[PDB]
Amino acid sequence: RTGYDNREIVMKYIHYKLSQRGYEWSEVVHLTLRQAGDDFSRRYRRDFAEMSSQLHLTPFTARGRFATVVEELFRDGVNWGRIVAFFEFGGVMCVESVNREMSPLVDNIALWMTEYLNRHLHTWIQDNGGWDAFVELYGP
Template identity: 40%
Template sequence: MVKLIRKMDPVGTRYIVVDYLNHRLSKNGHTWTHCPPLQDPPLKIHITMREKGDEFEDLYKIQFQDLVDQLHVTHDTCYPMFKAVVGELFQGGINWGRVVALFAFSGSLSTRCVEKGMAGLVDSIVDWVTQFIEQDLRQWIDQHGGWQGFVDFYSRRDQSANDDNPWVKYGVLGAVGVVVLGALMTQRT
């Protein structure tokens, strides 16, 4: 049987998601055996997303990991938790910081799934993130220059002395916190 490998557009959303999740898994010492082939060297969009995701996760590693640990991820709870966190994250609107937070959360969720013996969920997480971006964020992303706009935004930010507003970086932590609180309340009833 011949397996058909669908070539992904290296600047397309799905490729960016795959690249980022593979990066996070590799950085945490995991190999994603089902990862589609990736371009080497990576493009500027991939490098920028990796750097901003790393920065976000490194700044809030302990708090972020504690929250992800409390989610008690299983095959049955992973998607509802993902949807709840993402819904909370973007409830206040869309900005590039929240897009980075989406990738950071997805990277942590993927890592947690692999560590709990549910590596098959990584492919599902790729689908969920890609679908969410294409259905709910695509218009905003296009209005802000597409993925090149993301690169340009952070290039300008890196060249200026201003840092991201802290509330943008805390956005995903608040969303995860709401989900954790809800999950804990549900478990106690």
């Protein structure tokens, strides 16, 4: 169903983000999310450089960091751009975890991302046409 899609969408996104850094951890939705995320990460490159320096990820701090950042991200509601930002931020947390020899946290972050999508973003996504609408709007 939709939830099986979301977990797959998270796993394929993280897998690509980590592969970009040399770490080995329909498809139109995945391709669209990759391309939109790559655009987002270039546009907001400076923002992520600043935020990554403020995260201080450890196994003890990671869950709280994820929770507070994502709550700030969606403070004014949901739209597709913020959903892209959510994936990009999760990708950044995963890359930082690997950078810090904390690679097991990738699995935790993937689970947190999946549970946030299924519990908090699923209603908006379906209310706004599902992932198919995202592909229509921003796909190649």
